[PDB]
Structure 1
Amino acid sequence: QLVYFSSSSENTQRFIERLGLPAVRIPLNERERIQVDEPYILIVPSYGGGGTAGAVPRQVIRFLNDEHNRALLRGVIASGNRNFGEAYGRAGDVIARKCGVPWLYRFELMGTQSDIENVRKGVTEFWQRQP
């Protein structure tokens, strides 16, 4: 399974659509929170820094610091833009280090065809090497 966040600009949403895999969206509305039942990879865009100063969107922080959800986190994929330099995909690095999970992939905006193919292959292989 997959969990993702996408802001109102919906680049990560557009990626998930084209990916073709079942996924659950962390609600855009900050007051709404969701619970997941199974192991998952998290896909999140980087947002340092406009509405939070921090790399990870508030909604994802809210989702993660519920230890129920955190315990089922198995990996992270981050999106963003290479033009941000060292900060490119920062959300993935931050989540990975804090939660003790691997940073699996890093892509730009809505993702290229290569990104889609790589992530499709990567995820299938990831669950093959998972309990």
Structure 2
Amino acid sequence: KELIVYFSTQSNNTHRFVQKLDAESIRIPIDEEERIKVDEDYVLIVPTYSGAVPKQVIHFLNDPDNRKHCLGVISSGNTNFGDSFAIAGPVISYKLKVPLLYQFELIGTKEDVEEVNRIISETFNA
């Protein structure tokens, strides 16, 4: 019943991180002509591109049926962006009124996988 909804561009950094996690995952389509419907609660995992939130994630969350099932957000990016590091998480947190659970870089480290696996378990029991 642990579920992840994620977005990842052609570079597939977020995709590859999510595949290292235990929880089942559903991918938001890159093609803006395509949409998904999610009928179960989920943790959202998205990268940052600063329009800090990818347009395809806005389209996903713009469906009230989809955004009602969000149990919080994890955001990725690169610390070299400074004040812009992983700000997709905060922006989504404020819009949905849901907790920012974690922040990570590129395809994630061994530590990130352990902490996110734990935080997803604790988020679905809380």
Indicate yes or no: 2:67 matched with 1:70.
Answer: yes
Residue matched to 2:105: 108
Identical pairs, percent: 53
Long gaps (5+) in structure 1? 49-53
Aligned length: 124
Instruction: Describe the superposition over 1:65-113 as per-residue Cα deviations: whole angstroms up to 9, x where unpaired.
Output: 1101011111000000011111111100100001100000000000001
Runs (4+) off by over 6 Å? none
Q: Secondary structure of the equivalent of 1:30?
A: coil
Residues 71, 123 of structure 2: 8 Å contact kept? no
Among 17, 37, 56, the alignment partner of 1:59 is 56
Indicate yes or no: 2:117 matched with 1:120.
Answer: yes
Residue matched to 1:96: 93
Letter in 1 for 2:88: A
In structure 2, distance between residues paired with 1:109 and 1:21? 19
In structure 2, distance between residues paired with 1:17 and 1:74? 20
In structure 2, distance between residues paired with 1:20 and 1:6? 18
TM-score (ref. length: structure 2): 0.96
TM-score (ref. length: structure 1): 0.92
Residue matched to 2:43: 41
